[PDB]
Amino acid sequence: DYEIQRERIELGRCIGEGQFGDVHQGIYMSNPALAVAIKTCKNCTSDSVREKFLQEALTMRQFDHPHIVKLIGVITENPVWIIMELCTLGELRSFLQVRKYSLDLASLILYAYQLSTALAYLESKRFVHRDIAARNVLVSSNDCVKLGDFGLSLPIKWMAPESINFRRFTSASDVWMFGVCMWEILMHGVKPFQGVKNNDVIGRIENGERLPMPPNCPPTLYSLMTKCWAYDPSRRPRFTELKAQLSTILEEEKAQ
Ligand SMILES: CN(c1ncccc1CNc1ccnc(Nc2ccc3c(c2)CC(=O)N3)n1)S(C)(=O)=O
């Protein structure tokens, strides 16, 4: 029973604007009072809007992983809300931009590794995400990030060529996106292909061009990104190998 009684929720501060409405921080008093994120939905009086909004809760219900945000519950009477576990430090991109000169390279590699464990878990369940990007990752603590959006908010600059050309989204296309996400992390939250028009990305990729090696990115990590960006989907690694390779890279950086 994921249905939460509204009297147990104490709506707090607005922390952002989601695709469906404002997102707030709050308190859920079950177990002692716990920190929660509350997604709201401006137009959920409409059944069509409500179904799309609440699909993220139906999807998240299925998962249990240390690096995937937990669904606490839903309130399906107007105003409709989705209650999730709060990642108190917020969005990964802003976190990386603000903490750029204080975070060590070991921390950036650790974030890529933790995301790879969540994605290996989703791969083990045959779940295809379709929207892997640093904008969908949240920060729980200085040493913990979580995949935090399954709403499906066109992200051309992150998409695998087969996704752009044929609308095909598979486990291999998620690996291409994860490569872009790793580039974003190592770039301290800079977006891929800044200044380039969406319809021109396609052409550069076809021409064999890829995102350049971020400054101070270990060459082993960049080589791993280039493997995620094989044009042929069948040539991209799976998450079991990405996770193992990232663990080695992380330990090599920790040793210095
Ligand atoms: C930012 N938003 C998001 N972006 C990406 C993914 C998910 C969310 C909102 N959902 C969740 C779920 C769990 N924890 C948090 N934590 C949090 C998110 C912002 C912030 C603080 C915590 C503290 C703060 O200042 N900002 N948010 S958004 C654009 O509004 O949908």
Curated annotation (Swiss-Prot):
**Active-site residues from the entry:** 131 (proton acceptor)
Q: What is this protein called?
A: Focal adhesion kinase 1
Kindly state the subunit structure of this protein. Interacts (via first Pro-rich region) with CAS family members (via SH3 domain), including BCAR1, BCAR3, and CASS4. Interacts with NEDD9 (via SH3 domain). Interacts with GIT1. Interacts with SORBS1. Interacts with ARHGEF28. Interacts with SHB. Part of a complex composed of THSD1, PTK2/FAK1, TLN1 and VCL. Interacts with PXN and TLN1. Interacts with STAT1. Interacts with DCC. Interacts with WASL. Interacts with ARHGEF7. Interacts with GRB2 and GRB7. Component of a complex that contains at least FER, CTTN and PTK2/FAK1. Interacts with BMX. Interacts with TGFB1I1. Interacts with STEAP4.
Q: Where in the cell is it found?
A: Cell junction, Focal adhesion; Cell membrane; Cytoplasm, Perinuclear region; Cytoplasm, Cell cortex
Which species? Homo sapiens
Q: Which residues form the Protein kinase domain?
A: 9-250
The record describes the protein's role as:
Non-receptor protein-tyrosine kinase that plays an essential role in regulating cell migration, adhesion, spreading, reorganization of the actin cytoskeleton, formation and disassembly of focal adhesions and cell protrusions, cell cycle progression, cell proliferation and apoptosis. Required for early embryonic development and placenta development. Required for embryonic angiogenesis, normal cardiomyocyte migration and proliferation, and normal heart development.
What the record says about family reads: Belongs to the protein kinase superfamily. Tyr protein kinase family. FAK subfamily.
Enumerate the residues binding ATP.
15-21, 39, 85-87
PTM description: Phosphorylated on tyrosine residues upon activation, e.g. upon integrin signaling.
Summarize tissue expression: Detected in B and T-lymphocytes. Isoform 1 and isoform 6 are detected in lung fibroblasts (at protein level). Ubiquitous. Expressed in epithelial cells (at protein level).
Q: Which residues of the full protein are shown?
A: 414 to 686 of 1052
